[PDB]
């Protein structure tokens, strides 16, 4: 009977609906503090980049909760956050399963593919724009010089150690880091053919050395990534011609 509603026993249920709405917010701030690489050293860089877009969503929550005075009653605030109530319930339990790194990057692209939502689509589009920033950074250094950059990442590392005595393919063993399943996922082109050819043009760039839709913007990055691999492939055809 403590307060419960000046209107009899109504706040006893309405305040639980917004405390449960308040319950999901302290999970997102709990998740953001535990994955930072100043308090942990076992999470991936793509796992860190998903949080970097999440923390920009946290200050939008903080700027909106600071503007709710002066409140009239408990309906005027919960109905303002009724649209925001659907969003926070989505935005917390997508990661809570436990996907990590490229699989977490695979969970978020599917969730950005789930339109018929029009306020949940651009925030996950923005999370796809931020979480793909370390992965796309590892793309252009690999196709223009061939340097592998991450010391600790979700993407598996191969050494590509070449014997000096045998010239076999300048590498003498590579295998694959995704050895047989080859499941490069969820980035532009969908990483089903061009992932096999950013492989081989990445093999040959260092052979030069030492002698409205989430799919449409995906398709806009796709053909430039088809254009530059064919541009690096037409250099190694000329390098085979001259040597």
């Amino acid at each position: 009977v403590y307060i419960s509603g000046t209107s009899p026993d109504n706040v006893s249920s309405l305040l639980t609906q917004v405390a449960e709405y308040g319950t999901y917010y302290t999970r997102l701030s709990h998740f953001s503090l535990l994955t930072v690489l100043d308090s942990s050293h076992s999470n991936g860089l793509v796992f860190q980049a998903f949080t970097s877009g999440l923390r920009k969503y946290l200050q939008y929550y903080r700027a909106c909760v600071l503007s709710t005075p002066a409140s009239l009653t408990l309906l005027t605030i919960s109905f303002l956050f009724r649209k925001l109530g659907r969003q926070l319930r989505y935005l917390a339990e997508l990661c809570c399963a436990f996907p990590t790194g490229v699989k977490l990057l695979s969970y978020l692209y599917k969730e950005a593919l789930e339109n018929s939502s029009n306020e949940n689509y651009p925030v996950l589009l923005s999370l796809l724009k931020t979480s793909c920033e370390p992965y796309t950074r590892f793309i252009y250094d690999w196709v223009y010089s061939g340097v592998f950059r991450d010391v600790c990442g979700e993407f598996m590392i191969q050494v590509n150690e070449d014997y000096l005595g045998f010239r076999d393919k300048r590498y003498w063993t590579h295998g694959y880091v995704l050895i047989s399943k080859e499941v490069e996922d969820c980035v532009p082109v969908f990483l089903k053919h061009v992932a096999n050819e950013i492989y081989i043009c990445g093999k040959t760039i260092n052979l030069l050395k030492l002698c409205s839709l989430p799919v449409l913007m995906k398709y806009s990055v796709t053909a430039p990534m088809v254009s530059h691999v064919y541009l690096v492939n037409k250099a190694i055809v000329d390098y085979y011609f001259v040597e």
Partner: peptide
């Protein structure tokens, strides 16, 4: 040899203008 490589980097310069046009289309959306 160098004349064939001059047209290859010229196509990369056209791709760089296409990447700036795609960034302007992302700013308009």
């Amino acid at each position: 040899a160098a004349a064939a490589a001059a047209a290859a980097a010229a196509a990369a310069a056209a791709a760089a203008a296409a990447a700036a046009a795609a960034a302007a289309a992302a700013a308009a959306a």
